[PDB]
Amino acid sequence: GLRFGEMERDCMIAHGAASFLKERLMEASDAFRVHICGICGLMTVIAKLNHNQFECKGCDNKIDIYQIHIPYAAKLLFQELMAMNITPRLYTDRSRDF
Amino acid sequence: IFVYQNNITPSAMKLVPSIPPATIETFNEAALVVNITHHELVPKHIRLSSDEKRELLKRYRLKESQLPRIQRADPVALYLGLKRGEVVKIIRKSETSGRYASYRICM
Amino acid sequence: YDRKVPSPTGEYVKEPEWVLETDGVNLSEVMTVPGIDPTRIYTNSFIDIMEVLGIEAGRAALYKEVYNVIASDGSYVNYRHMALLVDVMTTQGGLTSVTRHGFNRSNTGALMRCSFEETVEILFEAGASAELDDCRGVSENVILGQMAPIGTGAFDVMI
Amino acid sequence: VGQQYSSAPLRTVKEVQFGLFSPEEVRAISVAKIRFPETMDETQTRAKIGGLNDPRLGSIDRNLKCQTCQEGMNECPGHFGHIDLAKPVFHVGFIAKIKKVCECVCMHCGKLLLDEHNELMRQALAIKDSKKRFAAIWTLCKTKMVCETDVPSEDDPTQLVSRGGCGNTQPTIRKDGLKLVGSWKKDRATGDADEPELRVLSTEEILNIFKHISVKDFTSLGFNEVFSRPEWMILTCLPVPPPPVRPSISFNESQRGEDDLTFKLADILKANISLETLEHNGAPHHAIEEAESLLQFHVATYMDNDIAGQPQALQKSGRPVKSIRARLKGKEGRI
Amino acid sequence: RLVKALEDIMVHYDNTTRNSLGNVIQFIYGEDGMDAAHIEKQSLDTIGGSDAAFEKRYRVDLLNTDHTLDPSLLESGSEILGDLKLQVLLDEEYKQLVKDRKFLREVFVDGEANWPLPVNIRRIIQNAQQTFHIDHTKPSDLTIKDIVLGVKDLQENLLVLRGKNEIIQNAQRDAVTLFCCLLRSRLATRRVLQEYRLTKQAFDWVLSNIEAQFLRSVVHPGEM
Amino acid sequence: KAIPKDQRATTPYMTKYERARILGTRALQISMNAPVFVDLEGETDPLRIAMKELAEKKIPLVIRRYLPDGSFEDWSVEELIVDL
Numbered sequence A: 001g002l003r004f005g006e007m008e009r010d011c012m013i014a015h016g017a018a019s020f021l022k023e024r025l026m027e028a029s030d031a032f033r034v035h036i037c038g039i040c041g042l043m044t045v046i047a048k049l050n051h052n053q054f055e056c057k058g059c060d061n062k063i064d065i066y067q068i069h070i071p072y073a074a075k076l077l078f079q080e081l082m083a084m085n086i087t088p089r090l091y092t093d094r095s096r097d098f
Numbered sequence B: 001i002f003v004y005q006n007n008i009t010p011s012a013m014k015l016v017p018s019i020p021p022a023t024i025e026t027f028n029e030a031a032l033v034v035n036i037t038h039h040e041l042v043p044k045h046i047r048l049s050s051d052e053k054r055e056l057l058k059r060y061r062l063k064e065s066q067l068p069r070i071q072r073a074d075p076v077a078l079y080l081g082l083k084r085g086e087v088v089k090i091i092r093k094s095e096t097s098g099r100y101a102s103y104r105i106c107m
Numbered sequence C: 001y002d003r004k005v006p007s008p009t010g011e012y013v014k015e016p017e018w019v020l021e022t023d024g025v026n027l028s029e030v031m032t033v034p035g036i037d038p039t040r041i042y043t044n045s046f047i048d049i050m051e052v053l054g055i056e057a058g059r060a061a062l063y064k065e066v067y068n069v070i071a072s073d074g075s076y077v078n079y080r081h082m083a084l085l086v087d088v089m090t091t092q093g094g095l096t097s098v099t100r101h102g103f104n105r106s107n108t109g110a111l112m113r114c115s116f117e118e119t120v121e122i123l124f125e126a127g128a129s130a131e132l133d134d135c136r137g138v139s140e141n142v143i144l145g146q147m148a149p150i151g152t153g154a155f156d157v158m159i
Numbered sequence D: 001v002g003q004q005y006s007s008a009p010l011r012t013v014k015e016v017q018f019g020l021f022s023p024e025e026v027r028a029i030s031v032a033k034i035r036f037p038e039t040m041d042e043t044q045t046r047a048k049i050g051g052l053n054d055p056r057l058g059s060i061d062r063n064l065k066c067q068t069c070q071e072g073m074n075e076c077p078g079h080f081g082h083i084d085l086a087k088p089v090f091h092v093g094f095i096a097k098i099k100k101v102c103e104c105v106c107m108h109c110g111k112l113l114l115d116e117h118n119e120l121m122r123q124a125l126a127i128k129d130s131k132k133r134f135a136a137i138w139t140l141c142k143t144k145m146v147c148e149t150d151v152p153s154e155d156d157p158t159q160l161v162s163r164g165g166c167g168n169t170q171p172t173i174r175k176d177g178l179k180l181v182g183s184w185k186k187d188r189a190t191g192d193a194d195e196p197e198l199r200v201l202s203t204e205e206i207l208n209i210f211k212h213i214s215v216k217d218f219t220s221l222g223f224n225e226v227f228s229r230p231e232w233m234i235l236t237c238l239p240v241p242p243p244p245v246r247p248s249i250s251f252n253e254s255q256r257g258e259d260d261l262t263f264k265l266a267d268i269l270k271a272n273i274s275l276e277t278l279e280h281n282g283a284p285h286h287a288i289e290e291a292e293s294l295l296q297f298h299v300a301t302y303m304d305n306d307i308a309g310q311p312q313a314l315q316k317s318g319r320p321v322k323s324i325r326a327r328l329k330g331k332e333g334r335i
Numbered sequence E: 001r002l003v004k005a006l007e008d009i010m011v012h013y014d015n016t017t018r019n020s021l022g023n024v025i026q027f028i029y030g031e032d033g034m035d036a037a038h039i040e041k042q043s044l045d046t047i048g049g050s051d052a053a054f055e056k057r058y059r060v061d062l063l064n065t066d067h068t069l070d071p072s073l074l075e076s077g078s079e080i081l082g083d084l085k086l087q088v089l090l091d092e093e094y095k096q097l098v099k100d101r102k103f104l105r106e107v108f109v110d111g112e113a114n115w116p117l118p119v120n121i122r123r124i125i126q127n128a129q130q131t132f133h134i135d136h137t138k139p140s141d142l143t144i145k146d147i148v149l150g151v152k153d154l155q156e157n158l159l160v161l162r163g164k165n166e167i168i169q170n171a172q173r174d175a176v177t178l179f180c181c182l183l184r185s186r187l188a189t190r191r192v193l194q195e196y197r198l199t200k201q202a203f204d205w206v207l208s209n210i211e212a213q214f215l216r217s218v219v220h221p222g223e224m
Numbered sequence F: 001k002a003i004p005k006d007q008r009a010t011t012p013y014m015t016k017y018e019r020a021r022i023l024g025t026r027a028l029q030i031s032m033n034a035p036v037f038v039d040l041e042g043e044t045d046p047l048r049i050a051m052k053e054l055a056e057k058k059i060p061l062v063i064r065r066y067l068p069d070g071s072f073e074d075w076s077v078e079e080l081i082v083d084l
């Protein structure tokens, strides 16, 4: 054995060790920092760090913008998914517009 | 309520919603020889007014779709003439907490 | 069968009673038969109880049944657990099986264990049909380097 | 995790919407314009051209310039490019979809082959599941090959009800490589109407049919009108992936090596350039459609490799390949 | 296969039990909001016995020579013989005990008294017998009000839900019904005086304790 | 979608998962040579230290409890009662 399968994963969820499950199942790929537009979850934010200017253009946002961390693999995966006309809208709230 | 003895004409059955908004109910005598609600395993189902229902969804902040469900064809629901959308409060006994109320929304 | 019953003096009394056990089922037509208490009649086929007495009854039955299986081993398990099982198995108005019904789902998302290695055709299709992933699953949040909203990660800490 | 500041609030991802880029959108979001298949040379002098990796996109050589966002080859959410295709091309991974859709809607008017008047069809429309609906409708109406003008009412079959008007016949579509072919006929072996007719369903045909369809029709199907319009399963505007996506291998200074992805983009850009040229200068009519199937190939090639022909070209005499399905799989199987 | 079906169900901050879709599966976890590990099997005395022993045990009648609190048990036992205003309280107590006896016999038709419930009261008491060194010789300095009104306020605090509205306040009452039955049956005036001579402090302590243990027994939002 | 400091119905007490994630985070910072708000009685371990800062209600962190509807409640570590 020695692998960490669905089975030991469940036990860890029971224990409620949320952050452990993250540290184990994840691949240490150093978390990356990206700027996301709050209206169209795409990484289309020009982060001018020195002039506190952000801009999303096309969307017309200089205020509704967030900052998030994700593994580098994640970022490439998304840009790649963008490269195929697929939109991985990332959003920062569950309470949908419903 | 129409209490037939043996069976209804599959044609006469297409003559039920033929007069909205009024509703027609069909019950086979045999199904009534015994009142299931009196059974030892059937908790008491209490219908909620649309007001009562309203307050329900509010206080638990629920979408109408997140409530446990009861089938419109379900025996106890047929018994109370529930209609898709109405909600029943079910008060049952419990070996955990004396009383325990649950809710089901007819579909 | 034995049957603790209350006495007019108050104490519980073992007041024995006759019961018929059957090897076949027809709940619908036996309740009616006169001479029987149609209130206490029971079957171990919860599927028949449900059809005749309503899902809430069925729920009780299904529990009563799951219970005996464990009890018959001398074992004991807290009500809350089997209860929860019995409920999940019920919330939809009918008896839902859990020994895998669907070949795709039961309550998951379009990312967890991206099985089929077709995260290829799955993503293309997910783009087609504007899919909205809730991200409440452990492994979906893994791919985002996040903790899932469970135990430790079911709330945010702030400054 | 790194350093510096950000007046922007830190937050976690909660939901995730999946859609398809609209042609409009890719242009709103893109910062480049890409015209040259070249990269960093202008009369030897190293730099970059207003063509590929350069305009507003990130940089190399450890230069902090990039869409006035600074930072450099790190802490740089690669910025996307832009590039207009001549005649509309198809997206490899959706072709199968496109068919299934074309066989569900009547050509010319873009209306569902079956309406509410059909009781069978009603059952498939109540189903609230993209996979199921789109599946339940397709198997049900792919059969009809005549857009009905009138269908027997819910009452006496004596009276007929008028609906989408265009009793035009529907074609039988068969997939051939990267194109869609369909056959016609006035009934099956009915007097004065035998023998089929084979023509190729172009991309412009497909666009009008997918663009004329109305929301209530996408609905029955798996579309949202907001994040996914059937019309967006066909490419008009190619979103250009930024440099971090396709890194340029470099040993010390002065040594080639740009990712296979930048190569398939030169092909797409060239297969696009020779296409614009022809339609403008000298159009030999149906002699152009051969440079059109090339772009249709390099756009399909640049995204996936699993057809009759495998474009392993590049700079090798020993044919290699790296699309994107090939990259996702390597990372979907690694994660 | 079981883990697959319930792997997404958790207990939320509204003390509810739902799945990833937000659908309600249990309006209160385990119907009582309790955490299984803080539960123990205890016997609800009230159900069993003859109606007679029930009365010799929990019945207190200040307006009646024979069936009243012998002044050995209580300090104000002699000057309570006949307090009209106090009988009202005792009567309202005894009434509640009877309503309960009936309720428990409608829930558990067996006559079965032993059921798992949070907070092992039997212990807390022995944990008062030798913690304050109580001697069953001198009377208690306990007021018939201290008890009756003390036990009555305690119940206001158990709390599993806090919603400040009509619905939730009922749920709260529900989730706590069975446990209070046990509470009332154990901290009944005779018992607290004739069965385990508690003192205004030992008793004031016990009350305080039960509230604590009860609150540690509630399920934590987050439990999977 | 926010809920005023009054009207909060959630638990007054700190859940084990919350008290477990706080000690975690805090402990982390301490391990990263962060300013400490307590007087060590000669304690060296960060977790050990965080337990003390939690013990002396000196942790400027706030727990934002999300309901399943989307709304939320904000409780300051300081308020939350810490029994367990």
Ligand SMILES: [Zn+2]
Pocket: A037, A038, A039, A040, A042, A044, A056, A057, A058, A059, A061
């Ligand atoms: Zn934007």
Ligand SMILES: [Zn+2]
Pocket: D057, D058, D066, D067, D069, D070, D071, D076, D077, D078, D079
């Ligand atoms: Zn940049």
Ligand SMILES: [Zn+2]
Pocket: D106, D107, D108, D109, D110, D111, D147, D164, D165, D166, D168
């Ligand atoms: Zn048409």
